[PDB]
C-alpha cells in the first residue's frame, strides 16, 4: 500500500549530470511525496534506467528489466526508434506507456496502451497556418533540419492546394552547422518570410549566422515551430526591429507555475552553459515541463484507483497485466492544469490535440504575449485598436535620418566662416534650406552625410551595379 | 542458430530486428524501404530495395525531360514525403511549381 513503482528510461551521459528529462522526473516524484495532499496514502518510487537512445534492443532489455522487477508505468525512452520498441512491449504486457515527445505513429499500428503529452503536429501545423494568414503572407520559405520535419509540417505543405501561399521548402545542411550557403541563397532570392522547423539549440545557431549576414533587419519575419523560443537569449536581436514570432505552451503567467520554475533553477546549480550557445542560464525547457506533467497526470489516475497492486510480469511468457485496461482508461479520462496548461487527450488515439498556446513575439522590451491560440477558437490575437501603449516612449520622432547629398553650387555648399567647430551645420545652400523646413513640418532630426564617391547615379553596364547616391539608397 | 535474417519487411518491425542483428552480429538483409534515421549507428544491414535518394532524382529527370512547370505530387501516407524529399525541394533551384496533395 506504500509504493507504486514507476519506470523510467533515460539518456546515458558518460560524465555529465542527469538529463533534463530525468531530473524533472526526479523533481516531480519528490514533490508529490512531500506534499501529502495529492496521494495521501501512497508514496511513489522511481526506477530509472539508462539507454543509448538509438539502441532498440537495449531499450527492450530495460523495459523487460522493469517488468520483471514490477512497475506500473514506463515514462518513455523519448526517441522515435526507441519508443516504438517499448510501446509494443507495453502494449503486450498491459502496462501503460506515457510518451513526452513526438513520434511518427504509422496508420496501421493497432496500439492502445500509450498516451502522448507532447502537442500533436496535427494541431501545431494548423496553428502556424493561422499565423501565415493573420499576417497575410504569400511566399513562405519553410526550413527544416531532418527528414522527419516534413511529417511535422504536412498540413502547412498542403496549403497551396487551397490557399494562395507559395511554398519554397529548403533544408539545413546535415553534417556542418554553418548555414551561410543556405542563408545567402535566401537573401538573393528575396525571401523575407521564413518558417524555421528546428530545435531551440539550433534556433540560436542560425540567428548568430543570420546576424553575421545582413538578414536581421526590419524586413525579415521569422516564425519558429519550436515551443522553446522563450529560452533564447535575445539581447542583440532586440533593437534590430526583427519580427521574431513563435508559440509557447509553458504557462509562465501564473504565480504558482512560475514558483515551480524558480525552484527548478535552484536544482541545476552545477550546470555552466556555453557562452556562445546563445541560450539563457536558468529556465525549464518544454521537454522537461511535459515530464513534470506526465507524473502528475498519472498520479491523478492512481487517486481514483486505490486497489492498485503492482504485479511482476515476464516478457517471454506473454501474460497481460490484471488491471491493465481499467487503469489505462483512467489515464485517458484525466484533466490537470499542470505547467503546460490544460491537459486532456484525444480519446480515440491517446494523443494531445486540445491545448492552449500563447503566441509570443519579439518587441523592444523582449518577448511579449500578443495572442492566444485554441483549436476550436482560432487565433484570439489581441493586437488591438489601441495597439501600441499610451504614448511613444523616448519619442521616436528623432530616429535621426542620415540624409545623403552631394555638394554643388548653389544647392549644397560649405559655409564661409572662420570659427572652426561644426558638424551638420557647415552646410548651406538651397537644399539645406529645403531640408531644414521639411524637418520643421514633419518633425524629424537630420544628419547630413556627403556621398564619398561624388556621383549622382549611374547603371554601370559591365557590372550591373549602381554608382552614386542611388547606390546609397 | 541461423546465418542471416531476411527482414520482417515493415518500418516499425525492421527497426527492432536490426538492433538485434546489430547486437548479435548476424547480418540483416532488408528487401523494402525503411526510414533510416541519421544517428542510427548500425552496420550489419543491407537493403536491396532501391533508395529514394536515387528514385527521387530519377522522377526529377522526367519532369525536366518532359519540360513541366506545374506538378501535383499525390501521396498516400505521411512517410511518402520522405520518399520524395528531393522532388519537393526542387522549386528552390528549378522552375517547378509544386502542389502537394
Ligand atoms: C482528436 O480529437 C479531434 C477533436 O477533438 C477529432 O477531430 C480532429 O481535429 C480537427 C477538428 O476540428 C479536424 O481538423 C479539421 O478538419 C476539418 C474538416 O472537416 C471534416 O472533413 C473531413 C472530410 O470529410 C471529415 O472526414 C472529418 O470528419 C472532418 O471533421 C477542417 O475544415 C478544419 O480546417 C479548419 O478548421 C477550423 C475552422 O475555423 C480552424 O480553426 C482550423 O485551423 C482549420 O483551418 C480542420 O482541418 C481533424 O481533421 C479531426 N480528425 C479527423 C480524423 O477528422 C479527432 O477525431 C481526434 N483525432 C485526431 C487524430 O485528430
Ligand atoms: C514587425 O512588427 C511590427 C510591430 O508593430 C509591425 O508593425 C505594424 O504591423 C502591421 C501589420 O500587423 C502593419 O499594418 C503596420 O503598418 C506596421 N507598422 C509599422 C511597420 O510601423 C511590422 O509590420 C512587422 N514587420 C513585418 C510584419 O514585416
Ligand atoms: C478573446 O479575447 C480575450 C483574450 O485576448 C478573451 O478574454 C476576455 O478579455 C476581455 C478584456 O479584458 C474581458 O472583458 C473578457 O471577460 C475576457 N473573456 C474571458 C476571460 O472569457 C476573450 O474571451 C476572447 N474572446 C472570444 C474567444 O470570443
Ligand atoms: C500541495 O499542492 C496543492 C496543489 O495540488 C496546493 O493546493 C497545496 O497548497 C500544496 N501544499 C502546500 C502545503 O502548499
Ligand atoms: C487513504 O486516505 C483516504 C483519506 O484519508 C482514505 O479515504 C483512504 O481509504 C486511504 N487509503 C487506504 C486506507 O488504503
Ligand atoms: C530620440 O528619442 C529620445 C528623446 O526623447 C532620445 O533619447 C533617443 O536617443 C532619440 N532616438 C534616436 C536618436 O534614434
Swiss-Prot record, chain A:
The chain holds residues 33 to 505 of 908 of the full protein. It is a multi-pass membrane protein. Belongs to the glutamate-gated ion channel (TC 1.A.10.1) family. GRIK2 subfamily. Glycans are attached at residues 35, 41, 243, 346, 380, 391, 398. Sumoylation mediates kainate receptor-mediated endocytosis and regulates synaptic transmission. Sumoylation is enhanced by PIAS3 and desumoylated by SENP1. Ubiquitinated. Ubiquitination regulates the GRIK2 levels at the synapse by leading kainate receptor degradation through proteasome. The keyword Disulfide bond applies. The keyword Nucleotidyltransferase does not apply. One of its GO terms (cellular component) is postsynaptic density. GO terms for biological process: behavioral fear response; chemical synaptic transmission; detection of cold stimulus involved in thermoception; excitatory postsynaptic potential; inhibitory postsynaptic potential; intracellular calcium ion homeostasis; modulation of chemical synaptic transmission; modulation of excitatory postsynaptic potential. It comes from Rattus norvegicus (Rat). It is found in: Cell membrane; Postsynaptic cell membrane. Cold receptor activity activated by temperatures between 10-19 degrees Celsius. Its main location: membrane. Disulfide bonds join 64-315. Highest expression is found in the olfactory lobe, piriform cortex, dentate gyrus, hippocampus, granular cell layer of the cerebellum, and in caudate-putamen. This is Glutamate receptor ionotropic, kainate 2. It comes from the Eukaryota.
Swiss-Prot record, chain B:
Homotetramer and heterotetramer with GRIK5. Tetramers may be formed by the dimerization of dimers. Assembles into a kainate-gated homomeric channel that does not bind AMPA. Can form functional heteromeric receptors with GRIK4 and GRIK5. Can form functional heteromeric receptors with GRIK3. Interacts with DLG4. Interacts with NETO2. Interacts (via C-terminus) with KLHL17 (via kelch repeats); the interaction targets GRIK2 for degradation via ubiquitin-proteasome pathway. Belongs to the glutamate-gated ion channel (TC 1.A.10.1) family. GRIK2 subfamily. This is Glutamate receptor ionotropic, kainate 2. It comes from the Eukaryota. Highest expression is found in the olfactory lobe, piriform cortex, dentate gyrus, hippocampus, granular cell layer of the cerebellum, and in caudate-putamen. Sumoylation mediates kainate receptor-mediated endocytosis and regulates synaptic transmission. Sumoylation is enhanced by PIAS3 and desumoylated by SENP1. Ubiquitinated. Ubiquitination regulates the GRIK2 levels at the synapse by leading kainate receptor degradation through proteasome. It is found in: Cell membrane; Postsynaptic cell membrane. Ionotropic glutamate receptor that functions as a cation-permeable ligand-gated ion channel, gated by L-glutamate and the glutamatergic agonist kainic acid. L-glutamate acts as an excitatory neurotransmitter at many synapses in the central nervous system. Binding of the excitatory neurotransmitter L-glutamate induces a conformation change, leading to the opening of the cation channel, and thereby converts the chemical signal to an electrical impulse. The receptor then desensitizes rapidly and enters a transient inactive state, characterized by the presence of bound agonist. The postsynaptic actions of Glu are mediated by a variety of receptors that are named according to their selective agonists. This receptor binds domoate > kainate > quisqualate > glutamate. It does not bind AMPA without coexpression with GRIK5. The chain holds residues 102 to 202 of 908 of the full protein.
